[PDB]
């Protein structure tokens, strides 16, 4: 089942663990994705 | 045997070859001469 579900794209990337990122690397990638969003650390117009 | 009165004039320590023991001096009544 897992071999077939990895052959096909049954599980989208947001399902963890994904066999490619250890949980510490998952945290690192999550923090990098947070920091890489468009103007994420901006509060000039009250966005939060 | 069970349910049998003790014979008169019998010391429970004697007749069996029992020997006491003292772990310390703070336990038990003082030895009487």
């Amino acid at each position: 089942l897992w071999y077939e579900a990895d052959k096909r794209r049954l599980f989208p990337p947001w399902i963890k663990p994904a066999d490619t990122e250890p949980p510490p690397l998952l945290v690192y990638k999550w923090c990098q994705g947070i920091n890489n969003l468009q103007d994420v650390w901006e509060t000039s117009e009250g966005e939060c | 045997f069970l349910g049998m009165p003790a014979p008169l004039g019998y010391v429970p320590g004697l007749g069996r070859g029992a020997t006491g023991f003292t772990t310390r001096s703070d336990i038990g009544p003082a030895r009487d001469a």
């Binding site: - | 703070d26 336990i27 038990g28 009544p29 003082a30």
Partner: protein
């Protein structure tokens, strides 16, 4: 002197009961959970 007297008034009962039950003719000598059953 008074400090050690104040200690003495408190420690006297302990020594008295330890002695009187020691040089007397007759000597005297996990249960919460294994209680109600």
């Amino acid at each position: 002197w008074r400090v050690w007297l104040f200690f003495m008034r408190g420690i006297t009962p302990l020594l008295e009961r330890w002695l009187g039950n020691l040089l007397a003719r007759q000597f005297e000598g996990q249960r919460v959970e294994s209680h109600f059953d």
